[PDB]
């Protein structure tokens, strides 16, 4: 029997255990027949590309179905009463009672009600019409296509990475800290400043006119002179109505603190200074490890230096242990991700960011 | 000085400038001047690093069709070669550095032309789809003039700035990459064909009436732009030694001998192009006096 090609012990099984254990041990590359370290790493790299592409496709589908069968453009006009719509219902097995029961949210067909709170998220980051949602969905489709092609390409024989390229910890840490974290958060702060806040203050800014209108009446002069306090002057008043110019300030980076009086959420200018400061901190952190210019710390020396008199050897040889083992890295990553996911839940149910999301109790 | 800027941003000038034009005009003028000089009087630019100099200037015995600004030398490789890195002017002239200067200043110029278009469009109070349309030729030019030389690792195999140079570059490209079988050149071909079809149909409809239009014009203008985007991306992919479909010898018999398809003939023609002669064991004259 051919299946499973990656294991010969399972391939000679005459029973149905062959199929079950072929499905079970498919993605455990470390124990396939005739598996090398290089090939293992390259297969992992391609599969990770695949999961990223799947995530982007999932987000695109969420956006597309919300834009197509939702009530976003009516939800924005009354977030406190209208129910967000997730997707339409097409069940041929439905009766008439279910059809009349599920024609909810002021729709004209059986329809679901979104409880993932994506409407609040889209409203908070300045998306006000479903055409923007559609454009985002198409862009996400293109991004997923690009990542799938990237996986395919870096699987090719001449673009196949080496083993040493997969074991360069210093360069990966530097690039992912400064670039993946610092630069991305800086760009997010720029998005909030250039687009999200002006949309919150009843100004429509899109790709067609964002390059013209400056976020602040004094653009880039105080930033280079050093008069930063200008950007924090005249913040939004407590009588500010979200999405309009009534009682709105002109400041973009503030430390107002607390919650918006209307939306019961954190101030967007606070988000801007927060993500910008975080970006700066991460960019400083990303220049820590030496890659090839002499300047920078080396992890092996750090670990071997921090020996203890009570622990015998301290953190000796841990660099080799963590670099050679993939399960060690996966365990560390999973622990960190779980801790910060619990943190995300705890610090989001108590400090809501998206507008009117505290009122909608089911989504919270 | 404020009067100068008021004139620069003025929407009343006979030929608009804008703030992007302040950088567009010098680069375009420089590119045109150096391109004309290189076309007229450039010395024979050796192109492959061997003792076979190639001349592409009018004063060196070329007509209009045969004239072509020769690409850089294989000795240069991909390296940046400005004049000050040349120990004298003659080496820079003989190494194809004019080609690099022309292409760099011209790419800057077309980018600034895009900027000027958008700036005038927004200052005139219009939603700027004109730059969305103009991005397609810019993307194609960048893909075939900058992305491809980098992907191939040298400036030598870039497209010469000449009619015959374009044909030679295209044929060598087909030989080395099989662009025709690549889906993205077909996407570009479909885009340009649809553009021509829509042009003819729309002109006939308007002229026949001479005395859904919104989305009609939208898709009319959108089809060729998407096609050109796709073919530019295809060329950029081909730069890093990616090729079209290879359906050759993909059909066998019960025993194992290839049957052969039209794709096999395409592959044979490509191999014939990439070596401009016959194959082995074709009875060379055994004895010569």
């Amino acid at each position: 029997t051919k299946f499973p090609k990656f294991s010969q012990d399972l391939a000679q099984d005459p029973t149905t255990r062959r199929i079950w254990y072929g499905i079970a041990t498919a993605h455990d590359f470390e124990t396939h027949d005739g598996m090398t370290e290089e090939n293992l790493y390259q297969k992992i790299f391609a599969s990770h590309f695949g999961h990223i592409a799947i995530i982007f496709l999932w987000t695109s589908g969420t956006l597309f179905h919300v834009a197509w069968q939702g009530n976003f453009e009516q939800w924005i006009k009354d977030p406190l009463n209208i129910r967000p719509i997730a997707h339409a219902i097409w069940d041929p097995h439905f009766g008439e009672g279910a059809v009349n029961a599920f024609t909810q949210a002021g729709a004209s067909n059986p329809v679901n009600i979104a409880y993932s709170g994506v409407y609040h998220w889209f409203y908070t980051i300045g998306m006000t019409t479903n055409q923007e949602l559609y454009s985002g969905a198409v862009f996400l489709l293109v991004l997923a296509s690009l990542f799938l092609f990237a996986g395919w390409l870096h699987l090719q024989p001449k673009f196949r990475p080496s083993l040493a390229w997969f074991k360069n910890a210093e360069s990966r840490l530097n690039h992912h800290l400064a670039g993946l974290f610092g630069v991305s958060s800086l760009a997010w702060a720029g998005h909030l400043v250039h687009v999200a806040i002006p949309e919150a203050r009843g100004q429509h800014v899109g790709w067609d006119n964002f390059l013209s209108t400056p976020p602040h009446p004094a653009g880039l002069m105080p930033f280079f002179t050093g008069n930063w306090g200008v950007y924090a002057a005249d913040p939004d008043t407590a009588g500010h109505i979200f999405g309009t110019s009534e009682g709105a300030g002109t400041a973009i980076l503030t430390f107002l603190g607390g919650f918006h009086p209307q939306t019961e959420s954190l101030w967007l200018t606070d988000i801007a200074h927060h993500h910008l400061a975080i970006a700066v901190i991460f960019i400083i952190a990303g220049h820590m490890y030496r890659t090839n210019w002499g300047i920078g710390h080396s992890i092996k020396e750090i670990l071997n230096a921090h020996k203890g008199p009570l622990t015998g050897a301290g953190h000796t040889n841990l660099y080799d242990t963590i670099n050679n083992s993939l399960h060690f890295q996966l365990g560390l990553a999973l622990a960190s991700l779980g801790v910060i996911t619990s943190l995300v839940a705890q610090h989001m149910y108590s400090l809501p960011s998206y507008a009117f999301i505290a009122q909608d109790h089911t989504t919270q | 000085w404020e009067q100068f800027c008021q004139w620069v941003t003025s929407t009343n000038n006979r030929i608009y400038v804008g703030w992007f034009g302040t950088l567009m005009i010098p680069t375009l003028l420089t590119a045109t001047t150096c391109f004309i000089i290189a076309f007229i009087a450039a010395p024979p630019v050796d192109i492959d690093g061997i003792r076979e100099p190639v001349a592409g200037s009018l004063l060196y015995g070329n007509n209009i069709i045969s004239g072509a600004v020769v690409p850089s030398s294989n000795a240069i490789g991909l390296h940046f070669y400005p004049i000050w890195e040349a120990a004298s002017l003659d080496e820079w002239l003989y190494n194809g550095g004019p080609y690099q200067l022309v292409v760099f200043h011209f790419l800057i110029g077309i980018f600034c032309y895009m900027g000027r278009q958008w700036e005038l469009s927004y200052r005139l109070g219009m939603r700027p789809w004109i730059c969305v349309a103009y991005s397609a030729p810019v993307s194609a030019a960048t893909a075939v003039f900058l992305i491809y030389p980098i992907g191939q690792g040298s400036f030598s195999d870039g497209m010469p700035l000449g009619i015959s140079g374009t044909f030679n570059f295209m044929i060598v490209f087909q030989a080395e990459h099989n662009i025709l079988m690549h889906p993205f050149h077909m996407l570009g071909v479909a885009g340009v064909f649809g553009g021509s079809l829509f042009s003819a149909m729309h002109g006939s409809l308007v002229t026949s009436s001479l005395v859904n239009s919104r989305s009609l014009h939208f898709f009319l203008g959108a089809w060729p732009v998407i096609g050109i985007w796709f073919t530019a991306m295809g060329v950029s992919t081909m730069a890093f030694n990616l090729n079209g479909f290879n359906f050759n010898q993909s059909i066998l018999d019960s025993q194992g001998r290839v049957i052969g398809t039209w794709a096999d003939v395409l592959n044979r023609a490509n191999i014939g192009f990439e070596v401009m002669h016959e194959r082995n064991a074709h009875n060379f004259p055994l004895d010569l006096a």
Partner: peptide, 27 residues
Amino acid sequence: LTLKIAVYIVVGLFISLFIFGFLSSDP
């Protein structure tokens, strides 16, 4: 090397003028 310096100052002044004008857009 004088040509290199001249080109450097020329391009630097051009880009500086463009960015300075763009940040103080009168209209």
